[PDB]
Subunit: 249 residues, 4 copies
Amino acid sequence: MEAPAAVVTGAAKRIGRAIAVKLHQTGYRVVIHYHNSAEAAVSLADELNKERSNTAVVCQADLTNSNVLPASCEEIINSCFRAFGRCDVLVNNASAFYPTPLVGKTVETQVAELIGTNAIAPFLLTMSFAQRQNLSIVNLCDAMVDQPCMAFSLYNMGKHALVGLTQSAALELAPYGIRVNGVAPGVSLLPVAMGEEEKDKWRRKVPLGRREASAEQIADAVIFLVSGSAQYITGSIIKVDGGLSLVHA
Amino acid sequence: EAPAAVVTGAAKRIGRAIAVKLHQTGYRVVIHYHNSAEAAVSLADELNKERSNTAVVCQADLTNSNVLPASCEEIINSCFRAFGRCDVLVNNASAFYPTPLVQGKTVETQVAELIGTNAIAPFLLTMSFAQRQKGTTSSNLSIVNLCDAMVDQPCMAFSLYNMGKHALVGLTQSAALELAPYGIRVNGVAPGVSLLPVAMGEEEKDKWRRKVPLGRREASAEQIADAVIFLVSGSAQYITGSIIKVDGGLSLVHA
Amino acid sequence: EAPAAVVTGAAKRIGRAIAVKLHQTGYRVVIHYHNSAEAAVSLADELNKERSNTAVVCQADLTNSNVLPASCEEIINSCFRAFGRCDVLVNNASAFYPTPLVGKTVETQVAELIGTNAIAPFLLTMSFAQRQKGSNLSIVNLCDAMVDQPCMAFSLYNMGKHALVGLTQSAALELAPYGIRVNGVAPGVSLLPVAMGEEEKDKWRRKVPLGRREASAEQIADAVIFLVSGSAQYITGSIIKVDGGLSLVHA
Amino acid sequence: EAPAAVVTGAAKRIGRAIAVKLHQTGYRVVIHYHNSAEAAVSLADELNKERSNTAVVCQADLTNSNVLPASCEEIINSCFRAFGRCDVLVNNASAFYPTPLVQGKTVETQVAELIGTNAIAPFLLTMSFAQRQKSSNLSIVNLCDAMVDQPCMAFSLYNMGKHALVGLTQSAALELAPYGIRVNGVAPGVSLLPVAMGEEEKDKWRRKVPLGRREASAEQIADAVIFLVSGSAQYITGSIIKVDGGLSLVHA
Ligand SMILES: NC(=O)c1ccc[n+]([C@@H]2O[C@H](COP(=O)([O-])OP(=O)(O)OC[C@H]3O[C@@H](n4cnc5c(N)ncnc54)[C@H](OP(=O)(O)O)[C@@H]3O)[C@@H](O)[C@H]2O)c1
Ligand SMILES: NC(=O)c1ccc[n+]([C@@H]2O[C@H](COP(=O)([O-])OP(=O)(O)OC[C@H]3O[C@@H](n4cnc5c(N)ncnc54)[C@H](OP(=O)(O)O)[C@@H]3O)[C@@H](O)[C@H]2O)c1
Ligand SMILES: NC(=O)c1ccc[n+]([C@@H]2O[C@H](COP(=O)([O-])OP(=O)(O)OC[C@H]3O[C@@H](n4cnc5c(N)ncnc54)[C@H](OP(=O)(O)O)[C@@H]3O)[C@@H](O)[C@H]2O)c1
Ligand SMILES: NC(=O)c1ccc[n+]([C@@H]2O[C@H](COP(=O)([O-])OP(=O)(O)OC[C@H]3O[C@@H](n4cnc5c(N)ncnc54)[C@H](OP(=O)(O)O)[C@@H]3O)[C@@H](O)[C@H]2O)c1
Ligand SMILES: Cc1ccc(Sc2cc(N)nc(N)n2)cc1
Ligand SMILES: Cc1ccc(Sc2cc(N)nc(N)n2)cc1
Ligand SMILES: Cc1ccc(Sc2cc(N)nc(N)n2)cc1
Ligand SMILES: Cc1ccc(Sc2cc(N)nc(N)n2)cc1
Ligand code: NA
């Protein structure tokens, strides 16, 4: 059919959910990938299908690195083709985020989760996306990669690797007409359980309005990058951070 | 009431495309120019034919000098005089030519033109833009600087031009930080190769085109304008201090 | 009270020159290797001939797996076993080969390219830091000046090297309170791949503004020596490009 | 015989340390100064006491003006006159003060000083240095700033000048590589604090630095310059070495 289709990873909640909704509002059919949040994913799909029948499906997968991750990533892309006959956009949003101090989970599990979700799964999804082909990929990066959270080495390594993928894939996929870009939030949606006192500490550091980005503001940048208004843009990462990364210690 | 924009060096090429696209989006525009009077007036006539009293021209040299601050203050004042407001500033005007380090313009003229157009004038226009707002919620004020995706892999023998564009990156960042509390966003658009020089031969143009991964061709002026329009829009209201490369992957390509 | 250094992938090429220069500077060295056993033992022999009991070898595969943490721990332990201390870690070992997006399985390619270039450095950094509770301690990561202008079809490799820049920064921040500095050296073109043909090698050489030639291994090693030295005691989280201007050259 | 170096702004603080360490390494030195004649001569006297006729001074204002090209030519010429050669240029002199965007010196004077010292003078000195050349180890070292991407509030012009200096470093490295002239930078974070800065403010800055919660000594900055001019950096050009104790890694 004539409406384009997008895969959004980690789409049940928060930023991924807002991205899925905005893509849907723009006219895309969506694959809502999720790991543990089945109820939320299904709720979103039902909402979107109420708006337009047969325009949303869910796809469950763990994006932890392992021997089966390549197959899992191939399956996610295939789900979009099975549902909608095409796959125009891939949004790599899903992400593990927790500290891994240099000095519970084994360290190999932490590597698998943090590097898998933030870098390896994006790479494998990118491979599967390209092999099956205004086509574009958008990677959710992090404006703070050069001024990282203390004791978040593996997470930071994963997001750095994702910048490399964005560049490498933009270069390699350009001949196929597939653009590859990034959106780099600073502080957006905070953890719900984070105390407001801690939330406000982060908010007050942001020059532009002393507030976090909404999920919708992050989604707006993704929508620009997949649009016809970005058709010469490839290998670019758009910071959406309210000036946070410009603020010295 | 429609918002108003100043676009420097807007008579032709990329600056014209930005002015046109802003005007199509609903802005009133000040078309600043230096030598290209006929082209500036022609553009303003076309825009005014589309919507009466929505375009004016403003002449100024943006070469650095002791009067440049007054010239820059006057450009911003022209927008307020014509339209009663100034919501957007686009720093597009630019001198571009080689200044070899080893060997009829004096070097001091070259510094004045290359650093003036690309960096000092943007700074002064930024100051004047910000100061004029002090006499004013639904507002959406911003500045867009035309940067250069190739600043870290520069053209051979273009040191002063390169220095000017690096300075413009610094201004983008410094002004984003300092003007955020006033609700003025400050961002950049960094072309790779877009409209090639008028005097460049076709063989040389094709040499540049063939290096671009995405389509083996230069950006259209409209493609560059699209990124400016995004940055001024409500879809970018949390974006400040960002420079969007619009280069078809050119900067990713090794030697 | 000679300090001791671990250099990964030290049997040949750049890692060998690093081990040699560290030894010349007065370090005792652990020559880590994977497959190049003969070269590793030959080097240790040369170094021990110069100063007895100053070099040992340590074999390990640095491919990512569930045993990699134990392997990395063992490398660091080998330094303490031999020398009773470990002052310097040089993360040099590296897999480098294309992985196009469009008979190794992709999972093996991920494990080798991301393991050697990023995960092993991380685990070795962890083990190095945790063994320190007893100076001029530092870590040097061999990065790549071309990470932002990467080789076509080397996505996994490039991801690994980007991850290595992240580790360098993150570990510099986190280990600064323990006095452990963490920096990088980023070659452009240095010793060319053994499998590369002469015409192709010459193509790469001609790209380099400063002398139209590749860096020697000794030139790369000179920057490592500086970073571990007393003349770099306030330097942490810095990556020194050693590329003859190659990265400045547009397409 | 011995190589020769020009260090701008060499009478005090970081520039003085750089000149001292180059001299100790075996260089003859031109000590450039603007207002600090007494300190400049005191340094030369100290260095000449160590090795006769190995240090001279050169006065010049590095503010941008119509005479700045001539002034920069003279600084380079002074090295050739004293020592018959000029192997190293260190661009250290620098104006540093706020220039707020929203509201003493006029703005154009502030442009002349901040952009002149931090960028235009280095460009003109680079040009003169290269023109006068056209085995050897010729290089230029620019004193940059590790904080350029997380700048001081209200320091737009200073920041623009330092960004321009990054651009010069890269452009000149590319263009001068065929002549065997390397061009690099050293980027301090917090080193010797402003003389006017209050002691409590100094401590606020010190406590931000991960590596030792202190500023860099001038000698530590000089150590990186020494490396860059040495034979141990013969393949290094277009590189900027941060010497910041991890300060630039620390988020807000
Ligand atoms: N929030 C911010 O301030 C911020 C700042 C910088 C960057 N970003 C980036 O923006 C993106 C969105 O951020 P966010 O805060 O919305 O993310 P988030 O809530 O932390 O995580 C998004 C989703 O990732 C999925 N996920 C986590 N582990 C997974 C695994 N092993 N396999 C498959 N999926 C997994 C989860 O899906 P299920 O719930 O279904 O399990 C989760 O809902 C992320 O890439 C993040 O790094 C966010
Ligand atoms: N074209 C590209 O491929 C490319 C690549 C990278 C970056 N960019 C950037 O994008 C912007 C637009 O590029 P472009 O090619 O359209 O620019 P351009 O044609 O070279 O110049 C734009 C205008 O700048 C004005 N200008 C030059 N010197 C001036 C002075 N002393 N005072 C006042 N105005 C002066 C001229 O106005 P008058 O004609 O009225 O005299 C000219 O029409 C520039 O900032 C440029 O650096 C372009
Ligand atoms: N050469 C250059 O032009 C260049 C350019 C940019 C960056 N670099 C970086 O500089 C460093 C040294 O470069 P180089 O060319 O000397 O490296 P190299 O020869 O390609 O590799 C160095 C050593 O890495 C070891 N290694 C490879 N896979 C391994 C594995 N699975 N487990 C354990 N060790 C493994 C090998 O040891 P065994 O031989 O014992 O098996 C090999 O001898 C690398 O990090 C490289 O990425 C080099
Ligand atoms: N100190 C730090 O923490 C720090 C941090 C980042 C970067 N840096 C950089 O490191 C370098 C040295 O810093 P510093 O603190 O030692 O510098 P500084 O004391 O502020 O200035 C050094 C010298 O610059 C000269 N100078 C200033 N204006 C001049 C002019 N118009 N004409 C000619 N010379 C002029 C002065 O010479 P006279 O005294 O003879 O007039 C002054 O002594 C500078 O480039 C600076 O930006 C320093
Ligand atoms: C201060 C703060 C802000 C947001 C979060 S959620 C988060 C952040 C991130 N970079 N990646 C993912 N996946 N989730 C946690 C702490
Ligand atoms: C390869 C090429 C492409 C476009 C141009 S026009 C131009 C370029 C620029 N960076 N700034 C200005 N002002 N004009 C010249 C050469
Ligand atoms: C142009 C060129 C020069 C040297 C090599 S060898 C090499 C390079 C690399 N970046 N990592 C490793 N491990 N080995 C390959 C290509
Ligand atoms: C936190 C701090 C530390 C040192 C200074 S002195 C200074 C700094 C600079 N960047 N340039 C020059 N020329 N002088 C000012 C503030
Ligand atoms: Na780039």
